[PDB]
Design a protein around this ligand. Structure first.
Ligand SMILES: NC[C@H]1CC[C@H](C(=O)O)CC1
Length: 83
């Protein structure tokens, strides 16, 4: 709902994809479970976090989000390359 295909790292990216490249559907950036992690939307008027859609707060290579797995905290999302 901003940029749906990216040049690579999806800095601004808040498309619609929220699937970790090697795992699961991400757990939203809010507070739910498995854990009340950092990067909480309540502290950002910035157009960063959203529901579970991958972002890049530390601007990692591939945009990531927290997973739904109780042991896998963060994970890189596979977001579609603009081709
Ligand atoms: N290593 C990239 C980036 C991944 C998430 C991590 C966190 O969960 O805080 C911050 C660093």
């Amino acid at each position: 709902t901003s940029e749906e295909c990216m040049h690579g790292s999806g800095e601004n990216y808040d498309g619609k994809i929220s699937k970790t490249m090697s795992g699961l559907e991400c757990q939203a950036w809010d507070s739910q479970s498995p854990h009340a992690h950092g990067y909480i939307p309540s502290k950002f008027p910035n157009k960063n976090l959203k529901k579970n859609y991958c972002r890049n707060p530390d601007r990692e290579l591939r945009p990531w989000c927290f997973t739904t797995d109780p042991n896998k905290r963060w994970e890189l999302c596979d977001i579609p390359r603009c081709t």
